[PDB]
Design an enzyme around this catalytic site. Structure first.
Site, PDB file in Angstrom:
ATOM      1  CD  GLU A  13      -2.861  -1.351   2.211  1.00 48.38           C
ATOM      2  OE1 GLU A  13      -2.336  -1.185   3.335  1.00 48.38           O
ATOM      3  OE2 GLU A  13      -4.055  -1.725   2.043  1.00 48.38           O
ATOM      4  CG  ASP A 199     -12.243  -7.497   0.366  1.00 48.72           C
ATOM      5  OD1 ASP A 199     -11.146  -6.948   0.550  1.00 48.72           O
ATOM      6  OD2 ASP A 199     -13.188  -7.478   1.187  1.00 48.72           O
TER       7      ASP A 199
HETATM    8  C1  LIG Z   1      -4.707  -8.594   5.666  1.00 48.59           C
HETATM    9  S1  LIG Z   1      -5.954  -7.833   6.685  1.00 48.59           S
HETATM   10  C2  LIG Z   1      -6.702  -6.606   5.655  1.00 48.59           C
HETATM   11  C3  LIG Z   1      -5.861  -5.362   5.379  1.00 48.59           C
HETATM   12  N1  LIG Z   1      -6.461  -4.649   4.259  1.00 48.59           N
HETATM   13  C4  LIG Z   1      -7.649  -3.918   4.729  1.00 48.59           C
HETATM   14  C5  LIG Z   1      -9.038  -4.466   4.304  1.00 48.59           C
HETATM   15  C6  LIG Z   1      -9.313  -4.957   2.895  1.00 48.59           C
HETATM   16  N2  LIG Z   1     -10.472  -5.717   2.887  1.00 48.59           N
HETATM   17  C7  LIG Z   1     -10.938  -5.865   4.177  1.00 48.59           C
HETATM   18  C8  LIG Z   1     -10.023  -5.162   5.082  1.00 48.59           C
HETATM   19  N3  LIG Z   1     -10.311  -5.111   6.419  1.00 48.59           N
HETATM   20  C9  LIG Z   1     -11.363  -5.785   6.892  1.00 48.59           C
HETATM   21  N4  LIG Z   1     -12.247  -6.493   6.153  1.00 48.59           N
HETATM   22  C10 LIG Z   1     -12.060  -6.568   4.797  1.00 48.59           C
HETATM   23  N5  LIG Z   1     -12.939  -7.247   4.028  1.00 48.59           N
HETATM   24  C11 LIG Z   1      -7.510  -3.771   6.248  1.00 48.59           C
HETATM   25  O1  LIG Z   1      -7.507  -2.385   6.632  1.00 48.59           O
HETATM   26  C12 LIG Z   1      -6.164  -4.440   6.588  1.00 48.59           C
HETATM   27  O2  LIG Z   1      -5.106  -3.477   6.767  1.00 48.59           O
END
Ligand SMILES: CSC[C@H]1N[C@@H](c2c[nH]c3c2N=CNC3N)[C@H](O)[C@@H]1O
Ligand SMILES: CSC[C@H]1N[C@@H](c2c[nH]c3c2N=CN[C@H]3N)[C@H](O)[C@@H]1O
Lengths: 231, 231
Positions: A13, A199
């Site tokens: 990031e 996602d």
């Molecule tokens: C590897 S944990 C997820 C990382 N990316 C982010 C994120 C992407 N997608 C999701 C994240 N966090 C929670 N639920 C999700 N579905 C969060 O802020 C973490 O830093």
């Protein structure tokens, strides 16, 4: 806005932003690391916080203290919950809240940390800069709205429903934004949150995340870089 | 250990310690306040963190950074989960974990922040100091063991159920200790958690807390003051 702090959780990031900087100098505080340099004609310190609320809070407090940051911009990936969002779309977080804070037993609203507002407002000027950047931003669709955070990676329909029950208009979910926001609030420092969708926080979220992190990271970062240039 | 940081969430949890200190100077960092003075020939910086993980983590990192604290001691109230724990009883937290961290989607253990250990061990020297302090309170009820933290006030016989499911040996639950622990881990600082029971984290936890905060705070504080004298 002389010194801008940019905080991202994961190396993926911050890498694009780091490559964009001039005169980069590594700096560190215990196990936290950051990079001090310039982007456009702006002093910028780019920190790698690590994942989750405590890591983001400490990293943010450090950069504010150590570098007298004039504002803070969060960048990175998030679960998309807003109507119509797709992978790679960017959300400008105009308000942020903890979706997993619950001290309701003492009268506080869901998400509200005692002694603080239930939600944290991003800075008006910074929101405005992000909206202006969106006007010419070609890589992806951009929206504005509420981002909520908590100390969990959300990957279930039930998990998303819980959050929407408390935050009906939520657009994205992740794990640092509300910690950064609460830290800037407590340290009287303007901020804005920029995230892009990796996602949908649903049953496939973990599988989608790893594939789309780089695209989400890049789109978020490109927006952030446009904002910095404008400051 | 010549500079000791003491972190308490609420005014009621630091007030006695503040009165015991000498040559006290008020210090601040944004909305966070602390008191720098002396107790027993040690330099002591006593911080009022505010409630919850973000607040605790920022206040802890601030005191470590600005005052070069040699160790950190948490003091305060907690919900008793350990078998037989009563209001006023003290727990020396020898290990700490977040009960509400969940990145299990990617293989991490319940409570485990990515790239961090699942639990955080208090410093051996500080635990032995706590154990000596405990013996000075003749008769008093003091236990040792696991304290877990999360950004919510637990007041449900089934909220407790679920915590116990993840952490069977758990002795107490509160909202700051794992944030302080994680922060100390990341900033390589030794710490120990001292809490006293204000409630049993069940449906009556709110009224129990309102009534017994003064007691739990006092007993925790007295233990911490004695620990400071034993370093
Ligand atoms: C590897 S944990 C997820 C990382 N990316 C982010 C994120 C992407 N997608 C999701 C994240 N966090 C929670 N639920 C999700 N579905 C969060 O802020 C973490 O830093
Ligand atoms: C007024 S919120 C409760 C505060 N006291 C502590 C505590 C006492 N009892 C409980 C606390 N925290 C969570 N669940 C509980 N049953 C927490 O760490 C907060 O700082």
């Amino acid at each position: 806005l002389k010194t801008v702090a940019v905080i991202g959780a994961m190396e993926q990031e911050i890498e694009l932003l780091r490559e964009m900087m001039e005169n980069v100098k590594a700096v560190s505080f215990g196990r936290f690391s950051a990079y001090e340099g310039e982007l456009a004609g702006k002093r910028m310190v780019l920190a790698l916080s690590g994942i989750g609320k405590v890591n983001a809070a400490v990293a943010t407090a450090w950069i504010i203290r150590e570098f007298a940051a004039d504002c803070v911009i969060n960048t990175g990936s998030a679960g998309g919950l807003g109507k119509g969002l797709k992978v790679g779309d960017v959300v400008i977080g105009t308000e942020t809240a903890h979706h997993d804070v619950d001290v309701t037993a003492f009268g506080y609203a869901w998400g509200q940390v005692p002694q603080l507002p239930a939600r944290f407002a991003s800075d008006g000027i910074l929101i405005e800069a992000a909206k202006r950047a969106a006007r010419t931003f070609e890589g992806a669709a951009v929206e504005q709205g509420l981002i909520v955070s908590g100390d969990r990676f959300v990957h279930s329909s039930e998990g998303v429903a819980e959050i929407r029950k408390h935050f009906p208009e939520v657009k994205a979910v992740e794990m640092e934004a509300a910690a950064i926001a609460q830290t800037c609030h407590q340290l009287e420092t303007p901020f804005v949150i920029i995230r892009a969708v990796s996602d949908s926080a649903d049953e496939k979220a973990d599988i989608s995340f790893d594939e789309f992190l780089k695209t989400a990271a890049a789109n978020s970062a490109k927006m952030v870089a446009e904002i910095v240039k404008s400051l």
